[PDB]
Each structure stands twice: as C-alpha cells, then as structure tokens.
Amino acid sequence: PTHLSVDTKFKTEGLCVDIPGIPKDMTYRRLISMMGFKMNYQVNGYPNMFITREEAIRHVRAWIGFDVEGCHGTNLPLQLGFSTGVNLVAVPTPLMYKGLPWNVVRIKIVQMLSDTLKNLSDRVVFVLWAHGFELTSMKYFVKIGPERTCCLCDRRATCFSTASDTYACWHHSIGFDYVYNPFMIDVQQWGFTGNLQSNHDLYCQVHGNAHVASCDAIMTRCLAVHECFVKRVDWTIEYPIIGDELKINAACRKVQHMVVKAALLADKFPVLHDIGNPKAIKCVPQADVEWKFYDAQPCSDKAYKIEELFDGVCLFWNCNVDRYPANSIVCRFDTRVLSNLNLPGCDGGSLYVNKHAFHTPAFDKSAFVNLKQLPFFYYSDSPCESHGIDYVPLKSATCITRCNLGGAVCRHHANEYRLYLDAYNMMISAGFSLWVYKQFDTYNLWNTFT
Numbered sequence: 330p331t332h333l334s335v336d337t338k339f340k341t342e343g344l345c346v347d348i349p350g351i352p353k354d355m356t357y358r359r360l361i362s363m364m365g366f367k368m369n370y371q372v373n374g375y376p377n378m379f380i381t382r383e384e385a386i387r388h389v390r391a392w393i394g395f396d397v398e399g400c401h402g403t404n405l406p407l408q409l410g411f412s413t414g415v416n417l418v419a420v421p422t423p424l425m426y427k428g429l430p431w432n433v434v435r436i437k438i439v440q441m442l443s444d445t446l447k448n449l450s451d452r453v454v455f456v457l458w459a460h461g462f463e464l465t466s467m468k469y470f471v472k473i474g475p476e477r478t479c480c481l482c483d484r485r486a487t488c489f490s491t492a493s494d495t496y497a498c499w500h501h502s503i504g505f506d507y508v509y510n511p512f513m514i515d516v517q518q519w520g521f522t523g524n525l526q527s528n529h530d531l532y533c534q535v536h537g538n539a540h541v542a543s544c545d546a547i548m549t550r551c552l553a554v555h556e557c558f559v560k561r562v563d564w565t566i567e568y569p570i571i572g573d574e575l576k577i578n579a580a581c582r583k584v585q586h587m588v589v590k591a592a593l594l595a596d597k598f599p600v601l602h603d604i605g606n607p608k609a610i611k612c613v614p615q616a617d618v619e620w621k622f623y624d625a626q627p628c629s630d631k632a633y634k635i636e637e638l639f640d641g642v643c644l645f646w647n648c649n650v651d652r653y654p655a656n657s658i659v660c661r662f663d664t665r666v667l668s669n670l671n672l673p674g675c676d677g678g679s680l681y682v683n684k685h686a687f688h689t690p691a692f693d694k695s696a697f698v699n700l701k702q703l704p705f706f707y708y709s710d711s712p713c714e715s716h717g718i719d720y721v722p723l724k725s726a727t728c729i730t731r732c733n734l735g736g737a738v739c740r741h742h743a744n745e746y747r748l749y750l751d752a753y754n755m756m757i758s759a760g761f762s763l764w765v766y767k768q769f770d771t772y773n774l775w776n777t778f779t
C-alpha cells in the first residue's frame with residue numbers, strides 16, 4: 330500500500346447541499362469522473378488525484394488550503410479562496426479581487442501557486458473541507474495526465490500552457506495557464522462532527538471567519554496542521570533539503586558550544602541542568618561542571634509550564650517553556666520568522682521544517698522576563714597560530730581572544746571570528762533567538778587569559 334486506491338470509498342455527506350441527490354456509495358474513481366477528469370487506465374506516476382494522510386504529511390510544504398464559495402455554478406459567480414489569503418471571483422460569462430472569466434482567473438492561480446511553492450515543494454496539495462463547488466471548479470484550472478518533466482529543467486512538471494502546448498515546474502511557469510497533476514485531500518474524510526469553524530476553533534483563536542473563501546481555506550489548512558503535527562507527532566519522517574538546513578544546523582551546534590562554554594567560564598557554575606532532547610550530548614565535553622540531563626520532547630501544542638516540568642545554571646536549547654527561570658541559557662525559535670523552512674501553523678504557532686517537522690508554540694516575549702537578550706561575542710582560548718583565504722586586519726571589541734587582549738587580533742582568530750559571525754547571523758536569521766541570565770558579562774572572560 331503506497332498510494333490511495335481509487336476504489337477507496339469517499340463519504341459524500343459533506344457534498345450533498347451543493348450536490349443534492351449525490352450517491353452515498355461513492356469511490357474516488359467515480360468522484361474523479363464526476364469532477365470531469367478521465368484517468369484512461371494510466372500507469373504513469375499519477376494513480377489518483379487524492380492522496381493518503383501519510384502522503385499529505387510527507388508533502389506538508391505543498392499544502393495550500395482551498396475553498397470555493399458559490400458567491401450567488403454554470404449561472405453564478407464563484408469566490409475562490411486560498412490559504413495564501415487570496416480571493417478570486419470567477420464569472421462564467423484578505424485580498425479581494427473583482428469578477429473575471431476563467432481564462433484569466435486560471436493565469437492568476439498558476440502565478441500565485443508558482444510564486445508560493447517554487448522554493449518549498451515539487452508539487453501542490455490542495456487541502457479541502459469539501460462541500461462540492463471546489464471539486465466541480467477544478468476542471469476550469471486543472472489538467473491531468475502522465476507524470477512529466479519541465480521543458481526548461483529536470484524538475485517534475487506542475488503547470489501546463491495551452492498557448493505553447495508545453496509543461497513547466499513552479500520556477501519556469503511564467504505565462505502558463507493550467508495547474509498540471511495537482512494533489513488534493515479532503516479533511517472532512519478524517520471523521521469530524523460539525524462544521525469547519527467549530528472544529529478549527531476548538532484548537533485555534535488566531536484565525537477568524539470573516540465569511541470569505543480565503544478564511545475557510547486558512548482554517549482548513551490550520552485544522553489539517555493541528556491534526557497531523559500538533560495532536561499527532563511523527564519524528565521518523567524525513568524532509569528534503571530545500572535551503573540552508575545544513576548550514577543552520579551546523580551554526581546551531583557552534584553557537585551552542587560557544588555560549589555554554591563562555592557562561593561556564595564567566596560564572597563557574599558547579600552544576601548545569603540540560604533540559605530537553607532525550608538524545609542530547611554534552612555540548613562542552615571538556616567543562617569541569619556536573620552535567621545533569623532531563624528529558625523533554627519538543628512541545629508541539631502549548632509551551633511547557635515550568636511548574637509541571639521538574640542552583641547552578643539551566644540550559645533550555647529549544648525546550649520551549651512558558652517562563653524561564655532566572656538562572657538560564659536559552660535558545661527559543663521565533664515562530665514569526667519569514668523563511669522557506671517556517672510554514673504557518675496552528676494558534677499562532679509555526680511549522681518549522683528542517684530535516685524533521687516541528688510544530689512550535691507561538692513566540693511569547695513574556696517567557697523571557699527573568700532574562701536578557703544574549704549579545705553577540707566570539708570567545709577563544711586556542712593558540713594564536715595561522716596553519717594552512719586573503720586578509721584585512723580585524724578590529725572588534727567582541728573578539729574575546731589573547732591576541733585582542735594584547736592589542737592586535739592574529740590572522741587565525743580573525744578568520745575564526747568572521748566564520749563564527751557568519752554562523753551566528755545564519756542561525757539568527759533562520760529565526761532562533763538567544764537569551765541569558767542577567768549577570769552574564771563577557772568582561773569576565775578576559776581574565777581566563779592570565
């Protein structure tokens with residue numbers, strides 16, 4: 330069992346107000362045919378327009394909530410809403426566009442999807458709370474067929490052009506008019522009682538219902554993220570590299586070692602309490618400190634209450650708590666960050682996808698009231714020696730080295746400082762924020778050179 334069988338039953342109760350008389354007994358095969366699509370018994374990488382929940386989770390970066398509201402359906406205009414916030418009105422003759430024929434609406438759909446998804450995914454997964462009009466509107470902007478490649482590159486085709494009779498991926502589809510071989514999933518098939526708003530509002534207070542199609546599209550994708558990444562968590566699923574994942578992860582390890590090593594040198598804590606990842610390793614293995622570990626998996630719903638969790642210093646490296654103790658070293662992902670790795674999430678939270686998917690609770694400035702922002706600094710006690718890249722003399726008050734103490738930064742420590750600054754800026758721009766106990770002072774590191 331790899332894909333969703335077309336002979337699987339599709340519950341049609343949610344469709345019967347828009348489609349009265351619809352059979353209760355219905356397969357994906359018959360539904361796809363009713364939607365105006367002919368599959369022609371094809372064994373060419375596209376067995377079904379609909380996909381399993383497991384396949385949707387593997388392709389979370391492709392998810393686009395989609396809703397169609399019958400604005401007045403052959404004779405009536407339709408409001409097409411997307412989880413990007415776009416509302417397009419299609420006439421059969423929070424961004425709200427005026428009524429236009431399908432031949433121009435389809436061009437906009439292709440541009441919008443291509444700009445949203447080109448740096449995220451090789452496909453689109455339309456996330457529905459299906460009532461009928463959305464499924465029957467698909468024929469006006471979707472073409473299907475065998476799996477194909479782009480006319481300008483090796484990527485799989487996501488768009489088709491009637492003007493040129495060619496196929497393109499999301500990066501090369503300028504001027505294309507049809508969405509080609511999209512995927513879709515009906516959330517309503519998962520077993521819910523009551524309408525979209527009542528189920529969404531049980532878990533989220535951030536998305537309202539301004540009664541437009543884009544609001545429903547947003548709520549649908551939000552509910553789907555909640556079910557698949559908040560209440561259910563699968564950390565075995567690996568996601569492809571689409572950006573700076575490796576540099577960010579390597580910068581995270583470098584910054585963690587730097588900051589913890591300096592805090593231990595500056596304040597000489599006898600014990601460190603490492604709270605988080607049950608598979609954590611000592612980030613400063615040469616430190617004299619009594620290192621004690623406490624297991625906590627990432628909280629994907631609400632931040633851990635400090636009282637419900639369980640002297641010296643506490644290390645919370647991505648272990649999200651409601652209020653950090655004053656004696657802490659903290660790395661907290663800022664959910665508001667705009668990046669190709671960070672997808673919109675549930676109840677203010679965000680879905681951070683870097684090797685694994687981590688639904689992260691909303692960033693809250695009040696968690697850090699007992700702490701202060703950790704300032705940038707570079708510390709090194711390694712010998713001053715080049716060994717082995719051109720040079721311009723480094724002058725910096727934050728290069729905490731023996732050579733800078735002696736009045737002149739050596740070439741080795743200048744190269745290491747600049748590499749560290751690049752790693753630091755990478756990690757910060759990825760959305761990570763750093764916080765520390767108020768007594769932390771880098772002036773206390775200079776006396777480690779005596």
Ligand SMILES: Cc1cccc(Nc2ncnc3c2cnn3C)c1
Pocket residue numbers: 604605606607625626627646647648649662681687689
């Ligand atoms: C506390 C903990 C346990 C297990 C793994 C991780 N790893 C993480 N690595 C990177 N980003 C993360 C996370 C958790 N959240 N966010 C946002 C953290």
Ligand SMILES: [Zn+2]
Pocket residue numbers: 479480481482483484497498499500501
């Ligand atoms: Zn291409």
Ligand SMILES: [Zn+2]
Pocket residue numbers: 529533534535536547548551552674675676
């Ligand atoms: Zn929501």
Ligand SMILES: [Zn+2]
Pocket residue numbers: 712713714730731732733738739740741742
């Ligand atoms: Zn030096």
